Structure formats: C-alpha cells, structure tokens
Amino acid sequence: DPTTYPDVELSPPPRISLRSLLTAQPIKNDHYDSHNYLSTHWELIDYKGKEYEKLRDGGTLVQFKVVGAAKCFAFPGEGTTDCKDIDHTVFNLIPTNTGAFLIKDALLGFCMTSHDFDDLRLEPCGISVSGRTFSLAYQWGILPPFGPSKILRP
C-alpha cells in the first residue's frame, strides 16, 4: 500500500483448508461444487475490528474468506455469508502447545467443535481456555489447501 519500500510488492492473503483434527474433514464453502477442490479453500484474513475485545481471550480474530468473492464462512453455514456480517463471520484463533488451534466465535466466545463426520457445533467452553487441555473434537488444523500442487524445483 503506501509502503516506504515500494520495491517490496504487497502479498495476498494465505490460502488454507480448515480441518477438524478429529475427523480430518475440511470446512467447505458453498461457492463451488462440493466436487470441486476449490470448495475446501479459504483465504485467511485478520479481523481489525475492536467490537470483540472483551471475549477475545488472547486469541487472534480472523475471517475465512471465499477465494475471489466477498463471502466468508459463517457458523450455521449452509454456506457463506457477507463478510460485512461480522457477528457471524468473525472467528478467534487460540494457540496450543501442539500446533493445533481452538477456534471460537468472536461474538459469543463459544468453541467450534466437531465430534463426528459432518458434525459441527458451537458450544460454551467456559470464560477462558488458557492452560486447559482439550480433545481432538475441539482442535483444528490450519493446513495447505486441499487439491493439486507442484513440487518446487530450485
């Protein structure tokens, strides 16, 4: 943007697949055919707003945006909704000692969990999760986007 160093080109948001560590099932968007791998891709963008600070719990507020559209993952997600609808599209990344992530909704401070295939829920996990340990149901992996890829050669 108005960087002091224009020689350094701005970088686009990172592409990821959000998988439950229990089922290894990726969170899908409704923008592509569920048969299309692009249906498992999201852009990780940080939320800069300040209306969720009281329950942030030391986590990092983010949004999972559809690639090439102004739509974001929303919890009771048939699919996605307006990125402008923060109350339903803003999530909270909570770090762990293993590299897995606990993900809470910014609004309620509830934990997103998956107990089995196609099972996705938002349940109260207390006032704070710091120092507490959780099972795979509460864990999410922010991994490479599902699909094809090419080996990088030097």
Binding site: D1, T3, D7, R15, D46, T60, L93, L152, R153, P154
Partner: protein, 261 residues
C-alpha cells in the same frame, strides 16, 4: 559461538490484511520444541504480536528505530518468554519492518547501514549476545544489489576497522532475504578478497520461496576460524519444515542454521 545457537529466518510477508495470524501460527511454531530457534530473524514483520510489551530499555542511540519488547508464548501462570528487537522501518505502511526474536536478552543492539540505507534501502538490524553478533537483513527486491555493501560494512565495523579491540573477537551472522541466489552473491563478494576470505555463505539447496528460488540464507564470519578457512564451519542450513504444524502463511519458507550433529 555462532554454532551454539539454533538460528532461523522467515520472511513473514506481513501486511495490514494478514499479520497477527502469521505470528501466532508460524512464528510460534518456529520458536517451540526441542528444535525451536534460539534466535529468529523476521522480515516484513508488520506489527508485533498485539500481546508483545515494550520494555523501558532504550537501545536506540541513532536515527533508525530499534526497540526491545518481551512476548509471552505461554500463559500468565506458566510463562514462556522471548525478546523481540523491533525496527519499524515502514513508516508509510508499517509492513516492511525487521525483527529479531531471541530467547535471551541482547547485551547490545546494532544498526548497520549500506551505501543506500538512508536513501531507499533497508539497513541491517542486529543484536549481540556475548561475543556473537546476529543480524537480520532484507535486501532490495531487484537482485538484492545492496547485499555486498551491507556485508562489507558489517565486516569493517566489527572485523577490519573495529572501534574497540573486543569487536575483532566477535563472531557475526547476517541472516535473511538476500533476494539473490547464494552463488550470485558469492560471485560478487569474491571481488573483495578481504570480505570474501573472512566469510562463509550458508544456504539450503532446496527452494526457499514459492517461485522455486533460494533467497533466504546466511553469511557469517567465525572469529575463531582463520582467514580463508571459514568453510570449516560446522553450521549447516536447511528448510525448517520440521517445525511446522500448519500451512506456511507466506511465500517464503523458514530456514534454519544449526550445528552439524
């Protein structure tokens, strides 16, 4: 000594849209575990983790900014700390910033300029732990043409023309995005034997960037190795993928420099 530390480097490619998540996803992983870095150089760091706290220590005696912060990677009750030496160079967009994360506090901090660091390029930011000095750099994107002046100037500052006798006994390591192939930088340094014979470039043979290019590595001078014998160094470089538990949130891969087992 340099080989006593596990050094790593990562161009975070921060920006106003995505910066904090990169710190908590990838940086946290690079610093953890038995193989976590003792010192991690970060380029294009944007903002520091929002939980980082600036200390009262003033380590900025020049014009280029350099501040010390502490960052708790663990809980309040069970802390896990590291120091961050932040240089907010990008006053325009605050994204092309340099930083050095250290588990140990720096005995001293340094800023070393090249022939263009006060024109358009970025200076080397560094810290000293005992008799070892560690610098992070981000050379110009167009071939990293400022690299040679940057290495040369650090060399004359500590090794050839030190302002105190101790400095000649300091070992130093310049780590980061050189924006040019190791062999390309190596060829250029050979134009200056004094610099070239007192250093050793340490880089991976695997790509360090999505384009397939090798751009992130280190160049060092071991004060306990004779001129023309730096290649005796028992430090090897390699991609630090053994530290990841997530997608790498930038186009640059983390690179580590560790003592040969």
């Amino acid at each position: 000594n340099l080989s006593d530390f596990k050094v790593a480097t990562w161009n975070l490619q921060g920006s106003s849209a995505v910066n904090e998540s990169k710190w908590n996803i990838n940086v946290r992983q690079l610093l953890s575990g038995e193989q976590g870095a003792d010192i991690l150089m970060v380029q294009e760091a944007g903002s520091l983790p929002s939980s980082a706290v600036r200390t009262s220590r003033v380590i900025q005696h020049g014009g280029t900014p350099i501040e010390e912060y502490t960052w708790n990677l663990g809980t309040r009750s069970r802390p896990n700390m590291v120091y961050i030496y932040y240089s907010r160079l990008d006053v325009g967009a605050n994204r092309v910033n340099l930083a050095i994360v250290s588990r140990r506090q720096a005995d001293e901090a340094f800023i070393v300029h090249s022939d263009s660091s006060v024109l358009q390029s970025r200076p080397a930011v560094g810290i000293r732990i005992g008799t070892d000095v560690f610098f992070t750099v981000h050379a110009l994107a167009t071939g990293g043409s400022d690299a040679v002046s940057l290495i040369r100037n650090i060399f004359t500052t500590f090794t050839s023309s030190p302002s105190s006798p101790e400095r000649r006994g300091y070992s130093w390591m310049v780590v980061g995005d050189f924006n040019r192939a190791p062999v390309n930088l190596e060829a250029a340094l050979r134009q200056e034997p004094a610099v070239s014979e007192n250093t050793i470039i340490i880089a991976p043979t695997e790509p360090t960037h999505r384009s397939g290019n090798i751009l992130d590595y280190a160049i060092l001078h071991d004060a306990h190795l004779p001129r023309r014998e730096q290649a005796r160094e028992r430090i090897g470089a390699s991609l630090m993928l053994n530290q990841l538990r997530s997608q790498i949130t930038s186009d640059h891969f983390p690179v580590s420099f560790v003592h040969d087992r």
